[PDB]
């Protein structure tokens, strides 16, 4: 799938899983 943080639609996926990037 993309990076974890891109387009602003929330993925907690395939080795993000430190990167929250949903949260503000």
From Swiss-Prot:
Tissue: Expressed by the venom duct.
4-hydroxyproline, modified sites: 2-3, 14
Places the protein is found: Secreted
Bridged cysteine pairs (disulfide): 4-16, 5-21, 10-22
Glycine amide: modified positions: 24
Superkingdom of this protein's organism: Eukaryota
UniProt function note: Psi-conotoxins act on postsynaptic membranes, and act as non-competitive antagonist of nicotinic acetylcholine receptors (nAChR). Is more toxic than Psi-conotoxin PIIIF. In vivo, has paralytic activity when injected intraperitoneally into goldfish.
Protein family: Belongs to the conotoxin M superfamily.
Domain description: The cysteine framework is III (CC-C-C-CC).
Name the record gives this protein: Psi-conotoxin PIIIE
Species name: Conus purpurascens
Parent-protein start and end of this portion: 51 to 74 of 75
């Amino acid at each position: 799938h993309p990076p974890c943080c891109l387009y602003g639609k929330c993925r907690r996926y395939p080795g993000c899983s430190s990167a929250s990037c949903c949260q503000r």
